[PDB]
């Protein structure tokens, strides 16, 4: 069944539309009837600054893709750019990770950081604005996740004025009994 | 609820780890709120 | 000599602690009403 075994890394230009991918695959596989291929792929789209990294192992159930996407906003007058990272066991986002940079050199200077875990209930939110006035500077600051029936807030705004200098924190951190009973299982398959 | 629970224990039959009746608050909120502002307005007092 | 110096603004703060079973508050204010007219009226307030 099988005529005999080759293990190769080889290499490939890829073309997606605009995209050129450097495309190198590295698979271990059974040549004739019997096909053994375990395949570690890894793809880079240099017109898009992407990686992927890619991995099929069916005996194990192995088919893990994971993509780091970087996208360029940026400019002279706005330095931008938005970062997305798929954790996807058998190519479904199980824990995804999301950025959102947008800097105005002049006033505006925004960033902002995301987690979220669909099946665990499990977000967090990291959120920060900079508006620059040669005038006044002001700041606002917001972090935040929630998971397993926990509130976490963390709110302090602060700014400058002529007239009066105002300054804020407001701290929270809420449980509710109940709710988190329900989020988190306190039941187990098998143990009824 | 308690008694609930010794009924179920009975039999040596339960549903669940431990026993999920809740003696403390539904909801347990800890929390600061403080703030620090003064008006620093450009007013002055002119002296010999 | 003419000279100008800059009010003595009014100064408020609060801090206010809430969790189960204990609420508690705090209150004071502070620094001149009126640089220039002579009027302080500073006062504080605590609660448990």
Known sequence: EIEQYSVSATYELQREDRALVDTLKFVTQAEGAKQTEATMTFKYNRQSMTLSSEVQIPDFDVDLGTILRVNDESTEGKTSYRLTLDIQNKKITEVALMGHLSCDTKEERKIKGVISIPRLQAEARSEILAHWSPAKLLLQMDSSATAYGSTVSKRVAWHYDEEKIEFEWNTGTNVDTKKMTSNFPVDLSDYP | ?48 | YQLQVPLLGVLDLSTNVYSNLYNWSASYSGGNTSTDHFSLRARYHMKA
């Open chain 2, 1 to 48: 609820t308690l008694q609930d629970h010794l009924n179920s224990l009975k039999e040596f039959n339960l549903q669940n780890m431990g026993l999920p009746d809740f003696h403390i608050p539904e909801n347990l909120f800890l929390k600061s709120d403080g703030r620090v502002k003064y008006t620093l307005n450009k007013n002055s007092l002119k002296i010999e």
